[PDB]
């Protein structure tokens, strides 16, 4: 018989023996201090729900940050080039033009 054991614990009574109580541990496979490759596998077994939620949160936050980067940079580049885009001999600092052209 297979019995799932939680951290709060479990009790089984077999025949007329007295009850035996056993408690689970946190011995998930992986390492909590190794590379993140070990981190994720270790924490997925302890709490797959939370682990997936946090990983998604981070992934989204990264995508937000990167999208913001363009949303700001491109607009600033736009407003910093368009006044000079309709002028002769746009003597902008060449570093600004190079940075803004990419």
């Amino acid at each position: 018989r297979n019995f799932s054991v939680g951290r709060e614990g479990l009790e089984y009574v077999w025949g007329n023996h007295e009850p035996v109580r056993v408690w689970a541990q946190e011995s998930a496979p992986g390492d909590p201090h190794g590379w993140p490759h070990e981190i994720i596998i270790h924490y997925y077994h302890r709490h797959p729900v939370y682990t997936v939620i946090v990983l998604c949160g981070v992934a989204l936050a990264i995508l937000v940050g990167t999208a913001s980067s363009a949303a700001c940079i491109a607009k600033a580049r736009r407003d910093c080039l368009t006044p000079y885009a309709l002028a002769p001999n746009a003597t902008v600092p060449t570093a600004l033009a190079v940075l803004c052209c990419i």
């Binding site: 951290r7 909590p32 190794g34 990264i62 980067s69």
Partner: protein, 439 residues
């Protein structure tokens, strides 16, 4: 001196705390719940068992008529039949082939074996939780029984304590309960007087000797067809037995929270759930002022291998420098690590090795020695076992439950986005200011 705390209600686990009275030296306080007894208030509705269908010896009005009386037996049932002309071993019994009526009578009483084989129906109300505590401060270690309600004080020899109310009221008993031969069941038995045949509690009475027994077993009498005198009857099976077969498992195997149920009176012992607020007035006589206690000069922490498990799977070493030989109290000022030892004989200079258990993957916790604080930094591995015969002595939180490697990775990944959005906003503002200035 009065102190307030909130002790986890988990029998068999010491809880340690430190009281730092400003004038005096620090004192240790370890609290253990030796036993608990959650007992409700109950009233007995009735008792039930196997009915004995008693059938009085029939009477015949030989050439006349009979009428059914109105008795007060349990499920009393009487009928009258027409001409029967009965015969016995002696022979015929009457002289009228017709108009030779018979009166059939039957009722029930308790079976003679019900004295031991019977079930009691009870209702329960809000249950008051009583606890026995062993509490130690410094050297003293008196015990005491108290009621956990937040009002009633558990006065001891001199140690005065108030406890409770319980953090979350709970009762393993549903509203209706049945207790049979030690075993307890949660069955919604039908109310007193509402007997339904063929189901539990088809016969009820206030007590085994009570004479006002009431039952409804659907007993019905039939016409006697054979010419030998006999009274036939058919009746539903004893619902008591039906229940006994379909009882299900008793509450000793079904109460949650690992609670060990016992009877006479109904109660629930060693029930681990919730938190108990405890306020305790420790007397100042046990307190010792810091002018007499050794105040240590310099202590540092070196932690050996540690592992996060219910057992004491961690060790560390303290190199200390003090000013006297004494009995300094050691303590952990974190909720996710607890030491084993409390008081260590301290010398002028030397070292002490201690054991501890933690729930966190990293030991990142402050140890205090006679008030002096030092931060231990460690890194506990996952436990090698999978199962233990001990309960986890410390709760697992969220904050100190992820390693600093994971924490560093997470904080880096979030701080990147945070700094990026901040830089983007700053860049937009700066571009606007530059356009305005050189406009």
């Amino acid at each position: 001196f009065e102190h307030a705390t909130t002790v986890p209600n988990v029998p068999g686990i010491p809880y340690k705390a430190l009281v730092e009275r400003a004038g005096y030296a620090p004192l240790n306080l370890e609290i253990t719940v030796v036993s608990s007894e959650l007992t409700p208030s109950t009233n007995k509705e009735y008792v039930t068992c196997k009915f004995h269908t008693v059938v009085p010896s029939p009477q015949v009005k030989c050439c006349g008529s009979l009428e059914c009386k109105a008795s007060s037996k349990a499920d009393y049932t009487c009928r009258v039949f027409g001409g029967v002309y009965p015969f016995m071993w002696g022979g015929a019994q009457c002289f009228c082939d017709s108009e030779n009526t018979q009166l059939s009578e039957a009722y029930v009483e308790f079976a003679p074996d019900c004295t031991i084989d019977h079930a009691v129906a009870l209702k329960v109300h809000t249950a008051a939780l009583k606890v026995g505590l062993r509490i130690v401060y410094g050297n003293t270690t008196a015990r005491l029984d108290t009621f956990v309600n937040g009002v009633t004080p558990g006065s001891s020899r001199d140690l005065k304590v108030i406890a409770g109310p319980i953090s979350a009221a709970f009762s393993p008993f549903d509203h209706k309960v049945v207790i049979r031969k030690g075993l307890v069941y949660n069955y919604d038995f039908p109310e007193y007087g509402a007997m339904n045949p063929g189901a539990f509690g088809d016969i009820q009475a206030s007590s085994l000797d009570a004479t006002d027994i009431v039952a409804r077993t659907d007993i019905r009498l039939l016409k006697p067809s054979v010419k030998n005198i006999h009274v036939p009857y058919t009746q539903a099976v004893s619902g008591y037995e039906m229940w006994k077969n379909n009882s299900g498992r008793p509450l000793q195997e079904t109460a949650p929270f690992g609670c060990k149920i016992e009877v006479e009176p109904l109660r629930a012992t060693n029930c681990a759930y919730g938190h108990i607020p405890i306020s305790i007035d420790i007397p100042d006589a046990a307190f010792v002022r810091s002018s007499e206690s050794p105040t240590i000069l310099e202590v540092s922490c070196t932690v050996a291998d540690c592992i996060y498990s219910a057992d004491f799977g961690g060790s560390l070493t303290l190199q200390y420098k003090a000013n006297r030989e004494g009995h300094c109290p050691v303590h952990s000022h974190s909720t996710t690590a607890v030491l084993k030892e409390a008081t260590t004989h301290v010398t002028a200079t030397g070292s002490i090795t201690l054991h501890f258990s933690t729930s966190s993957p990293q030991a990142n916790f402050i140890v205090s020695l006679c008030g002096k604080k030092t931060t231990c930094n460690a890194e506990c591995k996952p436990p090698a076992d999978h199962i233990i015969g001990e309960p986890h002595k410390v709760d697992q939180e969220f904050q100190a439950a992820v390693s600093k490697t994971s924490w560093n990775w997470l904080l880096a990944l979030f701080g990147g986005a945070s700094s990026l959005i901040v830089v983007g906003l700053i860049v937009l503002v700066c571009s606007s200011m530059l356009i305005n200035t050189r406009r």
